[PDB]
Amino acid sequence: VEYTEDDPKPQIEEDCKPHCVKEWAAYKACAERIKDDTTGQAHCSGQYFDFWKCVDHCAAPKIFAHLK
């Protein structure tokens, strides 16, 4: 395969993002539900981790296919 001077990883990560639409919906639901917070402790790190774990598991073997 042809190796590119530009970074292929953001494009591959964007490609796997339709495969994890459910986790993205859960994260956006969390982000909407803590919008009116005032205590500064509400966060959505767990659903964010779920979404990025799904995307990472998709994109991991396709990232090293494009690298020497």
Partner: protein, 243 residues
């Protein structure tokens, strides 16, 4: 807590993972060049010497020319003073700071750790290193980052003091390999994985020979065990007891 644990890193298909597989020594050479130009401004690697790179990564003359471009403090002379000299093969890799306190002072209080054993010193070593280097993402909702800190979900706690350092084309490889950020990260991760386990290839060759020899010797010892026990396992006992 999940946020204190941080995001786990996926399992990447490294070419040296199997017990039959060697290192990619071209990637070690390209990984050292990322170390010299990006890493070594703030990381020490104090247990490496230029002598250990010979036969793995460079020839003797290439490593000598690399070591001779460094300034090494030596002494004392006949007048009881400290001077500088050219580095040699027995010299260790230069440290960017004299001590931990100036390293903390140059980096907002955080000490950039030594990278000789950072691959074996982290859980899921190479995968965590690669995902940390290529993983400076946007923070999620409700997570704010103070000044001097940057978000990285692979770092435990999510707030690291190391900024984004790998950029496209920021290293000019001498074998024609195009240097994207991911290629640079993969090469430096390969070099660090070699640094934690420098004798992995020799250990695996010795392990293959040992496993073969012991597996043959198990059959030979089972043969000699069954030969000695044969007059007992086939003996005939006749008695008057019927019960």
């Amino acid at each position: 807590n999940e946020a204190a644990d941080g995001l786990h890193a996926p399992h990447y298909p490294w070419g040296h993972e199997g017990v039959l597989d060697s290192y990619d020594h071209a990637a070690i050479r390209r990984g050292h060049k990322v170390y010299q130009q990006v890493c070594a401004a703030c990381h020490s690697m104090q247990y490496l010497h230029w002598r250990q790179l010979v036969g793995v990564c460079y020839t003797e003359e290439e490593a000598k020319a690399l070591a001779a471009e460094t300034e090494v403090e030596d002494g004392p002379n006949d007048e009881g003073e400290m001077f500088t000299r050219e580095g040699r093969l027995f010299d260790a890799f230069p440290s960017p700071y004299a001590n931990e306190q100036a390293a903390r002072y140059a980096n907002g209080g955080a000490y950039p750790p030594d990278l000789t054993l950072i691959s074996g010193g982290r859980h899921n070593g190479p995968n965590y290193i690669f995902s940390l280097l290529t993983g400076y993402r946007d923070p999620p909702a409700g997570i704010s980052i103070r000044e001097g800190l940057y978000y990285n979900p692979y770092f435990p706690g999510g707030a690291i003091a190391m900024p984004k350092m790998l950029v496209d084309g920021g290293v000019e490889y001498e074998d024609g390999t195009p240097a994207s950020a991911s290629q640079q990260a993969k090469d430096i991760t390969t070099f660090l994985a070699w640094a934690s386990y420098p004798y992995q290839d020799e250990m695996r060759v010795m392990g293959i020979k040992a496993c073969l020899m012991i597996s043959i010797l198990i059959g030979f010892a089972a043969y000699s065990k069954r030969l000695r026990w044969a007059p007992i396992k086939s003996q005939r006992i006749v008695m008057d007891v019927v019960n």
